[PDB]
């Protein structure tokens, strides 16, 4: 077994902490047991892990999870709400070959929403569920119990985990609600990274990233807004404040409407990045294996497919997917004594109404 403690920092996350403990073999059962928790400016998460890598003789794994999660949306630069949740996951893992693995699982989650600041898109989802709270009060509550079928696919042919120079990584994760759940929806996420070395020593690499998200309701319901996709920040569209890209809250009057610059995410998302990895100027060859310079072009959009631009014609059409943000800049990664580090400086050359800018972004990791 082992335990660990992490400390880190990010521009969007603030000072972050992590700790965990794992019993390598829980009293002869062969199921590894673990307890992990992490915390940053807007999220507190904890779990109990219970996994066995050889549930069957030929590799199939059996995984259990029991989790608690506290999410402060205002501190993740969204319109304000509080989501406290807990649940369990049972996941089977099937390695198809050397570069592919599949996973299927059944999950239960309880979400307890509170402290929701009235806005059109959020309330629209509440209306689809049959919930009609006051539009002038921030002292509300919404609770749901959901059962989900979760599938996943990971392709990994990366030459190296730290600082890849060749190969691709693809991760597709989906879920759908099982009838009987309070929510009725599906949700799909696709992430890709492709490294192409353009020189023999693999110091000059071209990197293409894509990230896609789509989900909608079933049966006249919508997707819960706390399941929304976002874009902007250090890992999606650099130079943009975290989560700023996409629809903005259209606030209900307190006790007619008000446009805002508070992003609310959305149920469709698309991000793409083109990055040129180079050797690092002004650093010795002794410290090459531990640093990575790159120059990038980032873009992304987020939209709300159920935005009703008829009822709200005086506002921007938030269902519009074509308002594509763009940025360009230089990044620096360093495997520092304080852990994996990442500087980035980016100029958002293409931005839209209410998009907030974060030119300098900085991250020290706490997991590696």
């Amino acid at each position: 077994g082992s335990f660990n403690f992490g400390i880190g920092y990010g521009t969007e996350s603030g000072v972050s902490f992590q700790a965990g403990v794992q019993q390598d073999n829980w009293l002869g059962t062969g199921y590894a047991v673990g307890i992990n928790g992490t915390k940053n400016d807007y999220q507190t998460y904890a779990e109990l892990s219970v996994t066995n890598p050889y549930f069957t003789v030929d590799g199939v794994s059996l995984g259990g999870r029991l989790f608690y999660n506290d999410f402060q949306a205002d501190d993740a630069d969204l319109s304000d709400y509080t989501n406290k949740s807990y649940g369990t996951d049972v996941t089977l893992g099937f390695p198809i070959n050397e570069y592919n693995s599949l996973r299927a699982g059944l999950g239960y989650v309880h979400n307890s929403l509170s402290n929701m600041q009235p806005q059109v898109a959020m309330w629209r989802y509440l209306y689809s569920m049959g919930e009609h709270p006051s539009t002038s009060d921030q002292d509300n509550s919404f609770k749901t119990d959901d059962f989900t079928f979760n599938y996943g696919w990971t392709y990994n042919k990366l030459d190296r985990g730290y600082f890849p120079t060749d190969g691709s990584r693809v991760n597709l994760t989906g879920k759908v609600t099982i009838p009987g759940s309070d929510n009725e929806y599906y949700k799909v996420t696709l992430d890709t990274a492709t490294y192409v070395p353009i020189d023999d020593d693999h110091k000059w690499v071209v990197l293409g990233r894509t990230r896609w998200g789509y989900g909608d309701g079933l049966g006249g319901k919508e997707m819960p807004f706390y399941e929304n996709f976002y874009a902007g920040g250090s890992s999606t569209v650099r130079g943009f404040q975290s989560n700023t890209i996409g629809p903005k809250a259209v606030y209900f009057p307190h006790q007619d409407l008000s446009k805002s610059d508070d992003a609310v995410g959305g149920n469709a998302m698309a991000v793409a990045s083109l990055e040129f990895i180079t050797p690092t100027p002004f650093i010795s060859d002794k410290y090459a294996n531990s640093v990575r310079t790159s120059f990038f072009w980032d873009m992304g959009t987020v939209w709300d497919t159920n935005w009703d631009s008829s009822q709200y014609s005086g506002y921007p059409d938030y269902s519009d997917p074509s308002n594509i943000r763009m940025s360009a800049g230089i990044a620096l990664q360093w495997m520092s004594p304080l852990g994996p580090l990442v500087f980035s400086y980016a100029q958002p050359f293409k931005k839209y109404d209410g998009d907030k800018a974060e030119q300098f972004q900085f991250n020290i990791g706490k997991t590696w």
Binding site: G1, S2, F3, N4, F5, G6, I7, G8, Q18, P337, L338, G339, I364, G365, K366, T367, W368
Partner: peptide, 7 residues
């Protein structure tokens, strides 16, 4: 930073 201590 991450510190890992096998017991």
């Amino acid at each position: 930073w991450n510190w890992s201590k096998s017991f």
